[PDB]
Amino acid sequence: ATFEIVNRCSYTVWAAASKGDAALDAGGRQLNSGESWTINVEPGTKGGKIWARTDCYFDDSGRGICRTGDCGGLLQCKRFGRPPTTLAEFSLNQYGKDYIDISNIKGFNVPMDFSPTTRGCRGVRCAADIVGQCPAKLKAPGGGCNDACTVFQTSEYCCTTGKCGPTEYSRFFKRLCPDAFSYVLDKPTTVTCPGSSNYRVTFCPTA
Template sequence: MATPAATSLALAVGLLLVAFTAGAGAATFSITNRCPFPVCAAAMPVSGGGGAQLAPGETWTLTFAAGGTAGRIWPRTGCSFDPATGRGGCQTGDCGGALRCVLSGKPPATLAEFNLANGGAPGRYGISVVDGFTLPMDFSCSGAGDGGVIRCRDPGCPDGNHRPGDGKYRACPAYRDYQVVFCP
C-alpha cells in the first residue's frame, strides 16, 4: 500500500503532466482588427459557426485542434446584424446573412488559409486573393522566424495566391500559434 507522501507525489506529477500537455495538438489563432472601422471576422470550420464583430483594436481568439484541420479566416465589411438573432448581412465576404459563418464567404474576400498537419508535422498557411481583395492583411506563425509574416496590402500583393495552385504557402512548426491582422 502506498504511503500518503507517495500518493501525493504521484498526484502532483500527474497534475503537472496534464498541465503541460493541455493544449498540445492545438493551435491558437488571434485575429486583430487594426482598421479604423468595425470589421466582422469570419472563420471556418468552427463548431456552431465562426464569426465576431470587431471594433478597431479588438482581437478575437480561436483554438483549432491539430490533426488535419484545414480552414480559412476572412474579413467582412459593411456589415449589419440583428443583435437578437445574429442575422443580417455584409457588403463583402457575406456568408449567407449570418454573423457566425457555417458557409464560405461570398467574393470578394481576402482569405487567410491554413492546414494544421497530423502527428507533429509542420502546418501550412497563406493568404489568397483568388476570391478577390477586401482589406490589407498580415498572417504569421509564432514559430516561423523572421520570414514568417505574409503581407498582403493590395490586390496585386506578391505574397498572395492569385490563382488556384499558386502554392505560395509557408510552413509553420506544429502546435504553434498564428496571428491574423486586418489593416496592419
C-alpha cells in the same frame, strides 16, 4: 491552436473562421477598430480559412447581411464567405507540419497579415491597396475587388479543367501582392510551419 485575430483597420470588421462545412470556434464576431479576438482551432484542421467581412448588419438572433464575405447571412459563420474576400488559409498538423498562405483567388476586400506567433517560420502579407487600384471590370459595387472567376465564370479564370495559366487579372493581384495566391495554379506561396504553431491574423497591418 490559437489564432489571435486583430483589427487594425479604422473601420469595424466582422471576422469569420470556417473550414467550409463547419465553424471554427464561434465562427464569427464583430471586431471594432483595435479589437482583438482569440479563437481556438482544433489540431488537424484541414482547409481552414479566416477572413474579414465589411459593412454588416445583424439582428438580435445573429442573422443579417454583409457586403463582403457574407456567409449565408450568419454572424457566426459555418460556411465560407461570399467573394470578394482576402483569405488567410491553413491546414494544421498535416504529417507533422502546419501550412499557411494568403490567397486572392476569391478576390480582396481587406488587407491582411498572417503570421506565426511561435517560432520556426515566417509570416505572409497582402497589404497593398488592391481595392483602390482594382481594374474597373473587377470592382465589386458592393465593395472590394473581385477575382476574375467570380466575374466572368470561364474555365481559364476558374481553372476548371486543371490547366489554366496566369491572366491579365491574376497578374494584377500578383503585382500588388506577390506573396499571395493570384490564381489556382499560381507558383505556391505557402509557408511550412512547425506542427501546432499558433498565429495572428491582423487586418490592415500597415497604415
